[PDB]
């Protein structure tokens, strides 16, 4: 039935999404409830970001400096306060399409999609895995800042990230909605080291278990593995080990196809020895791996 | 700033999902003012579709018959009507979140979003190509159909796709919405012939304007190459031969990054030629084909 990168419905999201200025900046901020959450930075210009002291930056700064717009309407702003590297603006009207809503610190490896916005405008819509590294290999432009990451659970939108910078690298760095940042960055425009980039191992596995389930199997073999095994294969190719709860997080993948988590491994191992050898696996010439477990069997299943 | 494989904020097509049950039969319908749009094989048992009289089946069915759910209120239909493969319910309520809307029957390797559902309800987004083949390479199971395919500009939504089958080589198939299959595809569980899959090369050509933008270029190289010797390499790979239209619409491409369109030709002759080498572009270890040169515009721009 195919596999594609897919992202949640968006609609939920974009209903939040505000444009926030102070002076001269401008950039996204998520409105939920008579709250209006956006990145610190706003307070910044260019120059600003070499070295900002925001506690001495917000200081100067007063409810009215802040240019809270949706849609076509202003919305008043009734108290600032800055968490972590999060500005929180307390507006005196509540956003009549906030969701069902959680704040949630996702782990490195797991997935969630980006409502990419410039000024408050919704512009796309795209599937990211947050790195083991805590980075995000996102699409975001100037003007992208407070644009956020999110999963959804039936109707529970669970905010899990805001974009708010991008490295020399070409990477993106952000927070989690208590403006706490993934990883070592700092919302600062420095040289900021994004270490060794690892490959998500239960993700590829359960990305090979939904190319087994959708038909694409010429990579299954003859051979098995134990994870001490397979763990040596992973450190030689920069894939993260495989642990008994990747395992078991496989279960159901495993349940459904018949292959065992090790079988799949030794799949995995011979892949990475030997290549793809000019073939596709779910379209892709390279392992995928922003696929969680969960994703798989979430497409696979239909889940709305 | 990275590239993605974007999909449109999906949320202006959300608000028209509902669901259409007729008989046993249950599918997703597009509701806009007061018509709900679904694939005429709701009037089909699994036994139907072998070979269906269409005509025959919806005489045998009447305005209760097909029951219309937006969420949780029930629509009343006040009229019924095939036109080509569509079913076009008339129902007593205009829908109060319908967007400013055009249906538009689009050419094949022009891309689009595709809102997948299952009972009316949104479980998933991601951005197609109309194949040159006129398929589709989606994420489609049962009850998936009446799922739409859909462009934004600014606030109109243009629909050129709805979801109808599935050919058993795992692709698919569908219609415009006046209910027009693209291809030579019928709504029929018959075995039907998906021609010869070309590649799009102006999409390929215009993913690589987009490497070239955000940083990927190894594969620039110091050749040059004219439309019909390109033409022999592209017949030669099954990609689609590359005209002056497309070398046109690459313009504003190659103007901002001063690489000449025949150029970038031959570094894809050579890449066609000598494969990757191992290398990626844009964390791709093939040659894209879903992105148009609009859509590398649009995304290098971020027009929301
Ligand atoms: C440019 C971009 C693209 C993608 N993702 C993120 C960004 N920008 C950043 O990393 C942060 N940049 C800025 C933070 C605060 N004030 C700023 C004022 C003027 C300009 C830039 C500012
Ligand atoms: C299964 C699927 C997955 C992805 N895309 C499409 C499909 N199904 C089809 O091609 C059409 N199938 C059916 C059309 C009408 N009535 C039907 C009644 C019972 C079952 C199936 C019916």
Redesign the pocket.
Same mark, same amino acid.
């Not at 974009?163 to 991008?166: G, V, W």
């Given at each position: 039935s195919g596999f594609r990168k897919m992202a949640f419905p968006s609609g939920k999201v974009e209903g939040c999404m505000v444009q926030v200025t102070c002076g001269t900046?401008t950039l996204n901020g998520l409105w939920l409830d008579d709250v209006v959450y956006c990145?610190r930075?706003?307070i910044?210009?260019?120059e *600003? +970001?070499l070295n900002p002291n925001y506690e001495d930056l917000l200081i100067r700064k007063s409810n009215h400096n802040f240019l809270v717009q949706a849609g076509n309407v202003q919305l008043r702003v009734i108290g600032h306060s800055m968490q972590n590297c999060v500005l929180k603006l307390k507006v005196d009207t509540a956003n009549p399409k906030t969701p069902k809503y959680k704040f949630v610190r996702i782990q490195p490896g797991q997935t969630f999609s980006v409502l990419a916005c410039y000024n408050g405008s919704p512009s796309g819509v795209y599937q990211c895995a947050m790195r083991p590294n805590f980075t995000i290999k996102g699409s975001?432009?100037?003007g992208?800042?407070g644009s956020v990451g999110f999963n959804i659970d039936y109707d529970c939108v669970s905010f899990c990230y805001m #974009? #708010? +910078?991008?490295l020399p690298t070409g990477v993106?760095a952000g927070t989690d909605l208590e403006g706490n940042f993934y990883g070592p960055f700092v *919302?600062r425009?420095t040289a900021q080291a994004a270490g060794t980039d690892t490959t998500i191992t239960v993700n590829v596995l359960a990305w090979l278990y939904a190319a087994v389930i959708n038909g694409d199997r010429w990579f299954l073999n003859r051979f098995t593995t134990t994870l001490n095994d397979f763990n040596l294969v992973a450190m030689k190719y920069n894939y993260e080990p495989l642990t008994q709860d990747h395992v078991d997080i496989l279960g159901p993948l495993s349940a459904q196809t018949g292959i065992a988590v090790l079988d799949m491994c030794a799949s995995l191992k011979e892949l990475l020895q030997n290549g793809m050898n000019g073939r596709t696996i779910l379209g892709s010439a390279l392992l995928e791996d922003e696929f969680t477990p969960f994703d798989v069997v979430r497409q696979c299943s239909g889940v709305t």
């Open positions: 900046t990145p930075h706003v910044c210009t260019s *600003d +970001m975001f432009l100037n992208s800042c #974009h #708010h +910078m991008e993106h *919302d425009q």
